[PDB]
């Protein structure tokens, strides 16, 4: 669920997740997908495409189990959808951390999201 | 849609809407309803109750038209459902404005939202 997703992003990036990524670019946070602004935005693009493939559980609402072991996100066994979901969320949290070096505040609050250029099919 | 809602909140409160209300309390922004933390939170509680009356349109994704007349939100044209939706969004924007005097930053990023006490029926 959003809680786990938000938590993972905090753990990996050290950043307030909603503040840094809630309305970032054309792909991070609220809304759908669009042509990526930068590498951070591309992380979120991939993440939303990941959510699209999921069947059997609800990515926004469904809780899943994971642990913090040797400062690594370790997805619990869960079930097929929940584990795929956990891995979707882990991957984007990792991606966002790896692109903190080009994170740009000028994209942080993009209220022009509805008018982003259309994204390519996943 | 979220865009119109965000814009109304900006117009009434003068605040960055996602920043101030995206994760506030147990009712504002993401997630469902919960026992309200304060008057601001109760504004969002009422808003989400208002949404349940809607039949025919999608509050997160469906666009509607409104205008800014004599510094007032004026819901335009719109079918029966979109009219109601617009009026729901207008009501919460006004309410948030009216309760700026007790807005509390400590509730602003409430990542304990999944653990809010259960909301009473609307």
From Swiss-Prot, chains A, B:
InterPro entries in alphabetical order: PLipase_A2, PLipase_A2_Asp_AS, PLipase_A2_dom, PLipase_A2_dom_sf, PLipase_A2_His_AS
Signal peptide annotation: none
Molecular functions (GO terms): calcium ion binding; calcium-dependent phospholipase A2 activity; phospholipid binding; toxin activity
Annotated positions for site Cationic membrane-docking site (MDoS): 15, 19, 113, 118
SUPFAM superfamilies: Phospholipase A2, PLA2
Keywords, alphabetical: Antibiotic, Antimicrobial, Disulfide bond, Fungicide, Myotoxin, Neurotoxin, Postsynaptic neurotoxin, Secreted, Toxin
Function in brief: Snake venom phospholipase A2 (PLA2) homolog that lacks enzymatic activity. Shows high myotoxin activities. Also shows neurotoxicity, since it induces muscle paralysis when tested on mouse phrenic-diaphragm preparations. Displays edema-inducing activities. Also displays antimicrobial activity against E.coli and C.albicans, as well as antitumoral activity against some human and mice cell lines. In addition, it is effective as parasiticidal agent against Leishmania sp. and S.mansoni.
Protein family per UniProt: Belongs to the phospholipase A2 family. Group II subfamily. K49 sub-subfamily.
Note from the entry: Lacks hemorrhagic, anticoagulant and coagulant activities.
Subunit and partners: Homodimer; non-covalently linked (probable alternative/compact dimer conformation).
PANTHER family: PHOSPHOLIPASE A2 FAMILY MEMBER, PHOSPHOLIPASE A2, MEMBRANE ASSOCIATED
Name of the molecule in the record: Basic phospholipase A2 homolog myotoxin II
Species this protein is from: Bothrops moojeni (Lance-headed viper)
Source lineage: Eukaryota, Metazoa, Chordata, Craniata, Vertebrata
